[PDB]
Enzyme design. Structure first.
Site, short mmCIF file in Angstrom:
data_model
loop_
_atom_site.label_atom_id
_atom_site.label_comp_id
_atom_site.label_asym_id
_atom_site.label_seq_id
_atom_site.Cartn_x
_atom_site.Cartn_y
_atom_site.Cartn_z
N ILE A 100 -6.66 -6.51 -2.23
CA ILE A 100 -6.77 -5.08 -1.94
C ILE A 100 -5.36 -4.50 -1.99
CG2 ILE A 100 -7.09 -3.41 0.00
CD1 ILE A 100 -9.80 -4.71 0.55
N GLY B 272 1.91 -4.94 2.06
CA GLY B 272 3.09 -4.21 2.49
C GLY B 272 3.92 -5.05 3.43
N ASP C 72 1.61 7.29 15.22
CA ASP C 72 1.85 7.28 13.79
C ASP C 72 0.65 7.74 12.99
OD1 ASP C 72 3.48 6.93 11.55
OD2 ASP C 72 3.10 4.76 11.43
O1 LIG Z 1 -2.21 -4.27 10.28
C1 LIG Z 1 -1.25 -3.54 10.44
C2 LIG Z 1 -1.11 -2.27 9.61
N1 LIG Z 1 -2.20 -2.13 8.67
C3 LIG Z 1 -2.14 -2.69 7.32
C4 LIG Z 1 -3.54 -2.48 6.84
C5 LIG Z 1 -4.11 -2.73 5.62
C6 LIG Z 1 -5.45 -2.44 5.39
C7 LIG Z 1 -6.23 -1.84 6.37
C8 LIG Z 1 -7.67 -1.60 6.10
N2 LIG Z 1 -7.95 -1.10 4.91
C9 LIG Z 1 -9.26 -0.94 4.58
N3 LIG Z 1 -9.53 -0.42 3.37
C10 LIG Z 1 -8.56 0.02 2.39
C11 LIG Z 1 -9.07 -0.28 0.98
C12 LIG Z 1 -8.18 0.37 -0.07
O2 LIG Z 1 -8.05 1.79 0.14
C13 LIG Z 1 -7.42 2.03 1.41
C14 LIG Z 1 -8.27 1.51 2.55
N4 LIG Z 1 -10.32 -1.25 5.35
C15 LIG Z 1 -10.03 -1.77 6.55
C16 LIG Z 1 -8.71 -1.96 6.95
CL1 LIG Z 1 -8.40 -2.66 8.51
C17 LIG Z 1 -5.65 -1.59 7.63
C18 LIG Z 1 -4.31 -1.90 7.84
C19 LIG Z 1 -3.45 -1.74 9.04
O3 LIG Z 1 -3.76 -1.33 10.15
N5 LIG Z 1 -0.28 -3.83 11.35
C20 LIG Z 1 -0.47 -4.92 12.30
C21 LIG Z 1 0.54 -6.03 12.08
C22 LIG Z 1 1.95 -5.65 12.44
C23 LIG Z 1 2.68 -4.83 11.42
C24 LIG Z 1 3.88 -5.32 10.90
C25 LIG Z 1 4.58 -4.60 9.97
C26 LIG Z 1 4.10 -3.38 9.53
C27 LIG Z 1 2.93 -2.88 10.04
C28 LIG Z 1 2.19 -3.60 10.97
C29 LIG Z 1 0.92 -3.01 11.53
#
Ligand SMILES: O=C(CN1Cc2ccc(-c3nc(NC4CCOCC4)ncc3Cl)cc2C1=O)N1CCCc2ccccc2C1
Length: 346
Positions: free
Chosen positions: A21, A24, A139
């Site tokens: 998907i 980052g 955020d």
């Molecule tokens: O998990 C995070 C931050 N993210 C990264 C992410 C990716 C994906 C998704 C997500 N996407 C989708 N569908 C996508 C499909 C394509 O179209 C866009 C939407 N569905 C469900 C989720 Cl759940 C949610 C998240 C999310 O919440 N962190 C915790 C660890 C500590 C940390 C360390 C360093 C920097 C940031 C973080 C924060």
């Protein structure tokens, strides 16, 4: 184990048929077939343990999201990690899979007024719950608002979230800040640590403006430029609002600027609903003390078709961290992450 773009994904037996998907700083995310619930899910592989700040973000996210239960907030469905602290190098967080996010939608789609109204209602309904737990998201931005094919919206990414602390919100002028620049309330640059609920209302105001025109309202290129974008539309603060800024560096900076008049919302947004612009004005108030609160925003005539306080639930009790996290070593945060994820082990 399965691999995805040069990365192990140790998620079986339960989760199979992975598709990439994205990725980052957080790590990498896939969809996967859940073989218990028979649905595809998101799984994010986080590898945070060599960086104290990534550990903080991981622990905040896990503790908050496991406590919360709300239709407009992404849950955690499962957490996969090694059976021992020594063997734990990654944590996999399993969540409902959402098709897209508001950032992607705004790059590609005109939103009807009815869609803007419904998205805004869902953002505020979720935020009512977050704020009722004495939590600040800190955020909020389009890429943290997830959407499915029927336009159901879920707030995600609680890695910068904090318990509200208004009595310790004051700071000096130009104090460095972590959350996404374009959605930062003016007071962040002047005298605020972003420890009050009014910080989130400003970000939602910014999101509302962006839904109206598909462009960020205040796209600052650097720290102070963000304030001057805000002042460019709001105009010069009133004497009353200035008199609330007691720090002389911040006050004298504002006094140094040429007088600027307010740009009327109906000129920035000539096709917008007038009630949407009234609510926008109240969310994008310079003075955080005068800024509308989440429950007032829900009661605003713009949202009358949806407003139903009996169906806008609050958290069963205020949220509290066990101890402060900002100072803890990354090895201690690893232990806490271990303990917090124990309930998902068979
Ligand atoms: O998990 C995070 C931050 N993210 C990264 C992410 C990716 C994906 C998704 C997500 N996407 C989708 N569908 C996508 C499909 C394509 O179209 C866009 C939407 N569905 C469900 C989720 Cl759940 C949610 C998240 C999310 O919440 N962190 C915790 C660890 C500590 C940390 C360390 C360093 C920097 C940031 C973080 C924060």
């Amino acid at each position: 184990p399965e691999m995805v773009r040069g990365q192990v994904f140790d998620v079986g037996p339960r989760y199979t048929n992975l598709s990439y998907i994205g990725e980052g700083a957080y790590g990498m995310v896939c969809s996967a077939y859940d073989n218990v619930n028979k649905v595809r899910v998101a799984i994010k592989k986080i590898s945070p343990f060599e960086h104290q700040t990534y550990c903080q973000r991981t622990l905040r996210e896990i503790k908050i999201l496991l406590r919360f239960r709300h239709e407009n907030i992404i849950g955690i469905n499962d957490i996969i990690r090694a059976p021992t602290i020594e063997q734990m190098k990654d944590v996999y967080i399993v969540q409902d899979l959402m098709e897209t996010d508001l950032y992607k939608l705004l790059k590609t789609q005109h939103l009807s007024n009815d869609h803007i109204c419904y998205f805004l209602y869902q953002i505020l309904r979720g935020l009512k719950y977050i704020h009722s737990a004495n939590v600040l998201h800190r955020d909020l931005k389009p890429s943290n608002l997830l959407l499915n094919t029927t336009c159901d919206l879920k707030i995600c990414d609680f890695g910068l979230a904090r318990v509200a602390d208004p009595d310790h919100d004051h700071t000096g002028f130009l104090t460095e800040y972590v959350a996404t620049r374009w959605y930062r309330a003016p007071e962040i640059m002047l005298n605020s640590k972003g420890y009050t609920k009014s910080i989130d209302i400003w970000s939602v105001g910014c999101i509302l403006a962006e839904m109206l025109s598909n462009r960020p309202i205040f796209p600052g290129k650097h720290y102070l430029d963000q304030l001057n974008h805000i002042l460019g539309i709001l105009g010069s603060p009133s004497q009353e609002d200035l008199n609330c800024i007691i720090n002389l560096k911040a006050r004298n900076y504002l006094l140094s600027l040429p007088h600027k008049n307010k740009v009327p919302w109906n000129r920035l947004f000539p096709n917008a609903d007038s009630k949407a612009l009234d609510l926008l004005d109240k969310m994008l108030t310079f003075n955080p003390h005068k800024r509308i609160e989440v429950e007032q925003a829900l009661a605003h005539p713009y949202l009358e078709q949806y407003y139903d306080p009996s169906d806008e639930p609050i958290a069963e009790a205020p949220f509290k961290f066990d101890m402060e996290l900002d100072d803890l070593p990354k090895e201690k945060l690893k232990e806490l992450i271990f303990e917090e994820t124990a309930r998902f082990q068979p």
